[PDB]
Amino acid sequence: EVQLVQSGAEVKKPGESLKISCKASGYNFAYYWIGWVRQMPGKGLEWMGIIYPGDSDTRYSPSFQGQVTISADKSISTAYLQWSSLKASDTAMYYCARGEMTAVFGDYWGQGTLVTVSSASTKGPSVFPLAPSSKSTSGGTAALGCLVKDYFPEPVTVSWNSGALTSGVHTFPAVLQSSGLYSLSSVVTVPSSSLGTQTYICNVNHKPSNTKVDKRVEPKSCDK
Amino acid sequence: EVFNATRFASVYAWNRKRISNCVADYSVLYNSASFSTFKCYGVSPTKLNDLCFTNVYADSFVIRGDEVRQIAPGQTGKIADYNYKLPDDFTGCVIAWNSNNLDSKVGGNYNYLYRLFRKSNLKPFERDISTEIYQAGSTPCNGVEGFNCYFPLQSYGFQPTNGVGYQPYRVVVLSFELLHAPATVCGPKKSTNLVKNKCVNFNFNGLTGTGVLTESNKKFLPFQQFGRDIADTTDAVRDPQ
Amino acid sequence: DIQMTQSPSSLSASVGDRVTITCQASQDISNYLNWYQQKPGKAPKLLIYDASNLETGVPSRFSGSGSGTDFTLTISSLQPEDIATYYCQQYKILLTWTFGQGTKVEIKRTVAAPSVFIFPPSDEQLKSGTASVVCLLNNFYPREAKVQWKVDNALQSGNSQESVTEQDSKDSTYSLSSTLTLSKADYEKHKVYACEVTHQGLSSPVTKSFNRGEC
Amino acid sequence: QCVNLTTRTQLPPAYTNSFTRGVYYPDKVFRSSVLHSTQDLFLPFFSNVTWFHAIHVTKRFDNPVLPFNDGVYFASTEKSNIIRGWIFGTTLDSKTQSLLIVNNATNVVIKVCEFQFCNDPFLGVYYHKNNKSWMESEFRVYSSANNCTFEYVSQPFLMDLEGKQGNFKNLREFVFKNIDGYFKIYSKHTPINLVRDLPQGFSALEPLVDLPIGINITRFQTLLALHRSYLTPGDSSSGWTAGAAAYYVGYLQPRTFLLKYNENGTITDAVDCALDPLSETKCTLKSFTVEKGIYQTSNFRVQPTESIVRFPNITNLCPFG
Ligand SMILES: *[C@@H]1O[C@H](CO)[C@@H](O[C@@H]2O[C@H](CO)[C@@H](O)[C@H](O)[C@H]2NC(C)=O)[C@H](O)[C@H]1NC(C)=O
């Protein structure tokens, strides 16, 4: 049982440098090819390069020759990917895949590192919770959740009650607005009587500014 | 597209590729140090940049290391006799390079086959793909295995942990057709305007000569190329342009 | 260079139907093909690593065939969780190989009426100086529906945001959220706010309204 | 797969004399007014070839198989396109490759494929009265086709097919050779109209086609065209309908010849080195004429017939182990 683990999502600005890593375990690292694939939001895939760590042989696609660099380290069984000068068209998702060149290539992939580039500042999310009124609806099960829109860059993780409750949860994709912001909301359905003896805490975490917050939800009193 | 292919056929079913009507640059073949064995028969390596032929035939396969010396005219061996023979008057090029990175599997690769037994030798250029069983005894086999009867084809079984003796090697051979037909494969050399009535040295499709040119009202046969009346010296030529 | 194409671009079939998809190549490739499947927001997984040979750990209902310049992938009996994006990739030269265009497969189901909910701005947002009214459409099929906003029986346009989820794999339904954003003064000026939903599963448009002074 | 349709009636083959045919250019170089000597695969000047009849509505239904044996010379004079192409192989199945050439009023097509051969296949044609023409609709000559390697479509080379009524007023000659995995086809077309079958004229053969095929050939056959006949259910006819045609088949042999060119560069005369002692005397000298007297040629020899090997009869394995 082999495992591939990538590095965390990254945010940069034009004119800077970058480096990405990918680590493999559970097999002899020196006997298999490691390749890199990229995906730009909404479009198809495109190979970038492959590397054999044993003899240290590197091969690149014609379109991406000279703009990147691929290397491997057998001491800690790791593969890398390096840049020289970033620009405004290098934000994407990247995967590292393990393969072998006779029967099967692409057996196991990674998680997917997300790289963002822009020229702006980073802010922190503000969460406004919403809870049903003191009287439940006719559906037996009432809706609850939160609304967040003040943040850059994306994405941000939201969970409820430490992730124990997951059935009926739905999150909407964030949508760009006029002033370079995105909006998101989290909704969930809970039984009517649960408000009698249960409390719900939502935890929101993000890496860019590295902040985790928790907010409790209570039923809305009819403050006429 | 022939020196960079992902997969190569077995030595018992080698596939040939023909190349014609193109301008070749063999320098990149001999400048690179990747190749391990680079031999030429009948032609110097550099001079290939200043010759023209009619067509080029390329054959490719993969074999074990110890047999890389066997691919040559006049030699005898199991693959040399039962799989791939060479004519005694061969002219061309042979290239061989190690490919342990491309044809090795941790559990053992069993996708390559080679013939063990055959009734007789083959001609200098022949192919054998028959799956008929070989009989070494007297009792008829009737299509089943038995004593003194064996399946001809056998596997190789490459492994990454083996030594240089059992490591795979990719081999390509190049043959030229020449002195038979007007040239089709060319080399990179820009042309030059003609001279009518002056004594000069000329190079027509690799044929080098000296003398004075002229126009003659000779009823040359349209499908012919050139003629030589006597003493093995050309006198009548046709301009390719 | 080698370029590939897939057909049809997108198709819909019911549960238990037979589905087929065709991959075409510019020239000969000699059964050097791989079939990939990517679910929304995840990493791709291998499905078939040759013209015919089946990868281990895959349900037997998948099959593939073809050669030369034409290849076919067939799904015998469709299942609800088989909504994904399919790719065919060729690999002939050492490193020039490219993917295809992509294909999207969907599923149709019986029409389901939406559940409409309305949520007024919270006190914290009002203290912040802004207001946001939320209209939530839950468990509706199919995807198309219309949302309108009325403030004191006056239509509003160009000041709302619209977010729609992907197809659920459990009930095969969608979800919709509409947000109306206003200043605190504009929100306090008016009293009644209504969200109207028009859907093919609704006999008549459904209006959910609330009064500022009644909540 | 196939339907057996054969006739038990058989007729012995018939021979004829090959006067002077069977000469072709041995190289692509140009020579003028020079006598040359060359050793190659040729056809003897005076020999007997086999002539086959292919007319059956008295009647004679014939389409047998002939061996190849290092080259074949083919001749025929057809007006209704009875013969179209040739098939080659050893067992004549899908295991080995084969060749098919088709010529029509549009173009000429040559294909090399691993076709499936029936027991006795033949191309059939049909007639449309509404269109008032002859075409082909039955293409069941082959069962399956796989592993195509060569296809070549070109304009007609030497076939006119202009005159609507021509009665054996042209000559077609073909030569097929195979060596070193190479197939060579030489062709020639000439105009003649004489009472006799073979003319007294002299002509050479030019090179037409070269193809690389890595196969061994030991058998070949021709193809025939059969016209569909509209027969009543109670007609109870023979079932075979074909036009009037016949062909000539010879053989080849390695021999040395002496050719004489001309001022323009066309082969006109040639002699053989092993026909009769006068020809051998001409071969020893260089000219076409000699003066009276005594001439010396190659000597005699008696060849062996058997081989004998004698060794001591000792039964003892080596201690080499
Ligand atoms: C594969 O393709 C080309 C054609 O010969 C060769 O690639 C060369 O690679 C290095 C650069 O990494 C240099 O020698 C040349 O710049 C490249 N040649 C080009 C771009 O034409 C390569 O030798 C071929 N064969 C193999 C085994 O890679």
Author numbering:
A (entry chain D): 1 to 224
B (entry chain B): 340 to 580
C (entry chain I): 1 to 215
D (entry chain C): 14 to 70, 76 to 339
Excerpt from the publication:
Like other human coronaviruses, the spike protein of SARS-CoV-2 facilitates the entry of virus into host cells and comprises two subunits, S1 and S2 (11). The receptor binding motif (RBM), a region of the receptor binding domain (RBD) present in the S1 subunit, interacts with the host cell receptor angiotensin-converting enzyme 2 (ACE2), whereas the S2 subunit is involved in the fusion of the viral and host cell membranes. Here, we identified a broad SARS-CoV-2 neutralizing antibody 002-S21F2 that potently neutralizes most SARS-CoV-2 variants, including all Omicron sublineages (BA.1, BA.2, BA.2.12.1, BA.4, and BA.5). Structural studies of 002-S21F2 in complex with spike trimers of Omicron and WA.1 showed that it targets a conformationally conserved epitope on the outer face of RBD (class 3 surface) outside the ACE2-binding motif, thereby providing a mechanistic insights for its broad neutralization activity.
(A) Cryo-EM structure of WA.1 spike-6P trimer in complex with mAb 002-S21F2. Overall density map at the contour level of 3.7 𝜎 showing the antibody binding in all RBD down conformation. The cryo-EM structure showed that 002-S21F2 binds to the outer face of the RBD that is accessible in both “down” and “up” conformations and is outside the ACE2-binding motif. The interaction buried a total surface area of ~737 Å2 with HC and LC contributing ~60 and ~40% of the total interaction, respectively. Most of the interactions are mediated through the HC and LC CDR3 regions, and the epitope aligns with RBD-5/class 3 antibodies. RBD residue R346 is the main contact point and is sandwiched between the HC CDR3 and LC CDR1 and CDR3 regions. Specifically, the guanidine group of R346 engages in multiple hydrogen bonds involving T102 and Y91 from the HC and LC CDR3, respectively and has the potential for a cation-π stacking interaction involving Y32 from LC CDR1. The T102 hydroxyl in the CDR3 HC also hydrogen bonds with the RBD N448 side chain. The other major interaction site involves RBD residue N440, which engages in a direct hydrogen bond with W33 from CDR1 and aligns parallel to the side chain of Y52 in the CDR2 to make CH-π hydrophobic interaction in the HC. In addition, the side chain of T345 in the RBD hydrogen bonds with the main chain carbonyl of K92 in the LC CDR3.
